[PDB]
Amino acid sequence: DQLDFLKPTIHHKVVVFMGSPADQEHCQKIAKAARELGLDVDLRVTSAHKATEETLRIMQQYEDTHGALVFIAVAGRSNGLGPVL
Amino acid sequence: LLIEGKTKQVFDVPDQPGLLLNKDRITAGAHDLEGKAAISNQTNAKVFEILKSAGIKTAFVKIASETAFLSKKCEMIPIEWVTRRLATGSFLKRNPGVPEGFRFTPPKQETFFKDDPQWSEEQIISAKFNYNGLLIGRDEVDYMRKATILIFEILEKAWALRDCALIDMKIEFGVDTEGSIVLADVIDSDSWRLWPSGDKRLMVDKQVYRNLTTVTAADLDTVKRNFAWVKDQLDFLKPTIHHKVVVFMGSPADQEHCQKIAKAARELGLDVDLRVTSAHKATEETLRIMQQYEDTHGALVFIAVAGRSNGLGPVLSGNTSYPVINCPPPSDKLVQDIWSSLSVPSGLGCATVIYPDSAALMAAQIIGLQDYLVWGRLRSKQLDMAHSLRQADKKLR
Amino acid sequence: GKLLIEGKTKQVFDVPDQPGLLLNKDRITAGDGAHDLEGKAAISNQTNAKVFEILKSAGIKTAFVKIASETAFLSKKCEMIPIEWVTRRLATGSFLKRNPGVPEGFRFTPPKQETFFKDDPQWSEEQIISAKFNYNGLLIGRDEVDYMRKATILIFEILEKAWALRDCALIDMKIEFGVDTEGSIVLADVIDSDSWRLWPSGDKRLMVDKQVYRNLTTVTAADLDTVKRNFAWVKDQLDFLKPTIHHKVVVFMGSPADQEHCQKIAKAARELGLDVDLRVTSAHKATEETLRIMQQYEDTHGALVFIAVAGRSNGLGPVLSGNTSYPVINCPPPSDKLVQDIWSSLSVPSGLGCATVIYPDSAALMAAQIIGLQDYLVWGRLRSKQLDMAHSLRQADKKLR
Amino acid sequence: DQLDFLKPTIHHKVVVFMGSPADQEHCQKIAKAARELGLDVDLRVTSAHKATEETLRIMQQYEDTHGALVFIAVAGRSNGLGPVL
Structure with a gap:
């Protein structure tokens, strides 16, 4: 679940x-x-x-x-x- | 055909694809009659020749008769573009505490809507005006602000040859068929505030008429002689240096x-x-x-x-x-x-x-x-170059 | 000490033993015009002290020294310029009425900055200069007005940056300046939830400022409770606004x-x-x-x-x-x-x-x-330095002129 | 008459x-x-x-x-x- 927060659009x-x-x-x-x-x-x-x-x-x-x-x-x-x- | 106004009529000219403006012998600061359409028309035409000679883009083509001139046909932006060098008039009422004669460097430039309430540039932008396919955005407003100041600066310099202080002005812009913004309508003695020797007492513009509560024919005569003088002084404003x-x-x-x-x-x-x-x-x-x-x-x-x-x-x-x-x-x-x-x-x-x-x-x-007209063209070229950059920017943006 | 200025929401007393000022906030809320009572003097004082700490750390010069108590603070003593300096990023509030046709949310780039006189009409910069204000030997001319315009926009930009860390849009602000004993212009009033317009998530509908109180046609104590609860949230949020990156x-x-x-x-x-x-x-x-x-x-x-x-x-x-x-x-x-x-x-x-x-x-x-x-504070200090350098040039220009 | 007009202030x-x-x-x-x-x-x-x-x-x-x-x-x-x- 934590992995979905690892590719964010900055x-x-x-x-x-x-x-x-x-x-x-x-x-x-x-x-x-x-x-x-x-x-x-x-x-x-x-x-x-x-x-x-x-x-x-x-x-x-x-x-x-x-x-x-x-x-x-x-x-x-x-x-x-x-x-x- | 037709377009109607207090001081002018604008008829279509059907044989020449491209308008005629016919000036009326009325004065509407309240409203009276005179012999002044010919004076206004001639005043205007001389002003437009000087601005054309500086490089300013105008709707004006040529004199048609003694009271009319031929103009490129274009749709008007309902804004009065006003430039001041000094504080006087309604500015004093809108800015209490600022004394008459307060100097504006660079010249102050304000805008007014055709209804005459004051608008901000934001208001003009949010109005989303659209004429001949040209929607007026901040770029177009920038151009009209810059040109208005430029036009005031040219005339200020010219009137200084005949020892007259130009104090403020009003002009109007329009949009031609090709989507270009041109300086349009009319610039005459109703359009400005002129003081000889910088002397408020010697004013020669439509302010003399505006200050009258009661209006005699004698008062009208002095207005005609003032406007006739201005028309006459304009002939010395384009000299060969x-x-x-x-x-x-x-x-x-x-x-x-x-x-x-x-x-x-x-x-x-x-x-x-x-x-x-x-x-x-x-x-x-x-x-x-x-x-x-x-x-x-x-x-x-x-x-x-x-x-x-x-x-x-x-x-x-x-x-x-x-x-x-x-x-x-x-x-x-x-x-x-x-x-x-x-x-x-x-x-x-x-x-x-x-x-x-x-x-x-x-x-x-x-x-x-030593040659204000050459000086004019340098400033006019700086305006051309800046407006070109925006067009180039709009294409690569 | 002796009282030297009375105010809707605050009193400022002299401190005769320490050559300054003491500012004491009162538990009243005076929606521009409507006025009721609350438990809010502590909330404001803390909100304020926190803001001034952020601005001091950027290098902006202020009258603020330190908190004296839970409702009061110590200020450097100075004569106030009777102008409210207002900055907007968006079109909202009274601006919409003064400028019909401009829609709410219209963005001001750079931030719009306007001035207001007492006693409270809008003034032009020309009006301020022709007014010839004179405080502590400093006559306010275009140079002084230039500095205050630039400073007001800067303070807005800094705080705008700070509030974005907690997902709040700073929409507009009002500050006031004074002139100290030595002839220097200092940021000098109070910046709290009465001074600004705050939107969480940029949602006007979630506003947390004193606009909530203004919107009330009728005012019950329950209504005042949500306004106290709103200001407390903001005082609390400021503790996250000075992080060590x-x-x-x-x-x-x-x-x-x-x-x-x-x-x-x-x-x-x-x-x-x-x-x-x-x-x-x-x-x-x-x-x-x-x-x-x-x-x-x-x-x-x-x-x-x-x-x-x-x-x-x-x-x-x-x-x-x-x-x-x-x-x-x-x-x-x-x-x-x-x-x-x-x-x-x-x-x-x-x-x-x-x-x-x-x-x-x-x-x-x-x-x-x-x-x-990554650090709005460093970024603040860069902008402050630019203002310092520009203000120093004018000092030099005035000497060779 | 001209002598006073010979050194003008520009x-x-x-x-x-x-x-x-x-x-x-x-x-x-x-x-x-x-x-x-x-x-x-x-x-x-x-x-x-x-x-x-x-x-x-x-x-x-x-x-x-x-x-x-x-x-x-x-x-x-x-x-x-x-x-x-």
């Missing part, structure tokens, strides 16, 4: 923020691997330079959880995205 | 790179010359060409494009007092070559940029300090 | 010369509330014992984070990363050669999840952020 | 944002140089990382002007201050 989200839609294939590679390890993954597009206020709004939306949360920041060139997150 | 951006390339080989700069800056409204000269192989003629550009009373920006060791940019800078920007062409060696642009000898104000689009922007940002 | 952050340094660097990591992590072990081992000079030491740490049921500190060419981090499943962070010590050497940390072979950081403080923060996923 | 401000009060001496060197050239300079401290929203609000307070405005971004390490402005 809530966690991995969010990949890319600064540009051109960084797509790269993000998909991350996504693909994470799903193979059993992670739940969302790909999102946002700029910390061109859409600063909205980038904050999007992440506060993920901050509305009781589950685990990991952010991966994908930004070519000068990366202000990750440090800003 | 003189400036030149000159790109010096060290070699004709750098041709595509410079054209990318030219193309970007021309889109921002700049006048660009592309020139070839060496600060090594033709030193004296390089100086000679910049002195020819220095014979102006307009603004002048030099962009220096030089591969390898860039002596061009620093040499211009040491010999002129106008701003010089370095924009080296792309190259594997740029990681090494770039320090020839950076690290100028002491006493040079040469600044450095690495992408051709970004040189054109620096040039425009400098010139926009 | 087990974790270890282990820093492996490849050489004892890296000691001061590791102690900088340690110092930072311990202040964030982490349990840190410093170990010395080489992945080159003692390959077998390196794995044996890490395997010993792998005999746990708690959380585990390894920090790898190795100068020159770093094989330690990547070797750990290849032999363990726990997160491994690389923090090379400072060096002129770090510019060349850092690629030994980055650019690991395929299939290794080693991550790289460059400053000791930032490595402790990564470890904290990882462990904070 | 209004402008150069604002220096430093990400940290440690960058103090460096900014004072910029200020000194610019003041000698006849510029009106303000020194401000703000982080695009630690105080993102407030940074945006400080520049918007400068954007309420009808005079000329130049921003100088002074940020050590990874400079997100400049690109975010």
Whole structure:
């Protein structure tokens, strides 16, 4: 009977923020691997330079959880995205 | 066909697939008659030309007659979008303790429903409005908030040429056939609050009419002369400012790179010359060409494009007092070559940029300090870029 | 001492021998408007003391010192700002009336934060600033209002996190601030079951807060009994809200010369509330014992984070990363050669999840952020630190301005 | 008649944002140089990382002007201050 409590569905989200839609294939590679390890993954597009206020709004939306949360920041060139997150 | 209003009628135009707005000679703050449809129509049309010239997307196409204009047909969002720079009017009643003239930085922006009670962005979202297949969500509300502030900022800047403080505004948005949100309805002297010299006493807008409990024909005359004046002042609000951006390339080989700069800056409204000269192989003629550009009373920006060791940019800078920007062409060696642009000898104000689009922007940002319309387009482009990201996000989400 | 503020539900008396304040809770329940009597002063005082203990431990600054008795507590003396600071995660209560068309349960992301004046209308931030309040020499401007908005949201977020351990949704809250003798803004009122809206299982129908009392049109003593029984359950539940979660952050340094660097990591992590072990081992000079030491740490049921500190060419981090499943962070010590050497940390072979950081403080923060996923208190302290840093910038801006 | 109109007062401000009060001496060197050239300079401290929203609000307070405005971004390490402005 105790064994049925040994495979529980734990809530966690991995969010990949890319600064540009051109960084797509790269993000998909991350996504693909994470799903193979059993992670739940969302790909999102946002700029910390061109859409600063909205980038904050999007992440506060993920901050509305009781589950685990990991952010991966994908930004070519000068990366202000990750440090800003 | 038809759509009816206090101050306007909007009829279908059946031969042209795409509306006409016919302005009425009435004033409905309570309600009286005048000769003001022509003034309003002309006021509006000049305002929309300026906003079109900044890059704002509008329903407005062209003047049809003295009291009408042709507009792209679109379904209105029943929200009044209001922007304030200062505290005055009904804001004072809704926020007791905040004194008249309290400054809003950034400009305050509030929304009102067509029934005029105030709504929050939440209320607008939870209303689940749907027009021409476009359901209005937080993204669409964000766009209208950002555009409303942007439109107020452009007009504020423009009215500052004729020494008038724009204090607040109201605009309305609609949705076109293709699902795009356009700035629509009408912007005239009923739409805003205008103070000359920032003087509340000299107000020229429909507030003069709103304050009257009793209304004479003389009072109406002074309102017409105020609105006629505003219509007249609008003609000086789109002036031709003189400036030149000159790109010096060290070699004709750098041709595509410079054209990318030219193309970007021309889109921002700049006048660009592309020139070839060496600060090594033709030193004296390089100086000679910049002195020819220095014979102006307009603004002048030099962009220096030089591969390898860039002596061009620093040499211009040491010999002129106008701003010089370095924009080296792309190259594997740029990681090494770039320090020839950076690290100028002491006493040079040469600044450095690495992408051709970004040189054109620096040039425009400098010139926009004197040309509000160029300044307008930079802000307008920031709005375009942010709205593009959301669309891209919606597709990968 | 002498009384200095009278209140619906509490009295606050001076304590003249100890240079503060004493707050004494009364056995009354004053449903906003309706008022009846109960046995509830003890319930509130305990509820309150527990909350403030949780918030002090996160690093939030409060007037609260210690419990004086079963119905009273000792507070640092300060002049109150007459604003109620309210935070909501969901749309409910009076908000629905003020914003018609927004349905109950509409989620506020980030939490909605609103302000209310006495005597109790809603104010804008502009209204608070133009009001020019002045307490203990601190005039309240936008900077002070900025801090209180940020603090109110933060306190809500912390408690929101705490209550989820016992499966309760914190729905909204109200707090109040005061200014101490030294000009500092402290969280200063009382946070009990009168201050918030609590839903077990996120089920509004199971609400345990003072809304139960408000909903009563008529009030019998039986009705008051379920409200006392509700508040007692909450006071009881708070004893499960500060649990000791087990974790270890282990820093492996490849050489004892890296000691001061590791102690900088340690110092930072311990202040964030982490349990840190410093170990010395080489992945080159003692390959077998390196794995044996890490395997010993792998005999746990708690959380585990390894920090790898190795100068020159770093094989330690990547070797750990290849032999363990726990997160491994690389923090090379400072060096002129770090510019060349850092690629030994980055650019690991395929299939290794080693991550790289460059400053000791930032490595402790990564470890904290990882462990904070299991310990809301560590997670609280990270958020508190961000607020501290932002508030410090304004102090600095005000001096160079 | 023209002589009084030959040296008119044009209004402008150069604002220096430093990400940290440690960058103090460096900014004072910029200020000194610019003041000698006849510029009106303000020194401000703000982080695009630690105080993102407030940074945006400080520049918007400068954007309420009808005079000329130049921003100088002074940020050590990874400079997100400049690109975010």
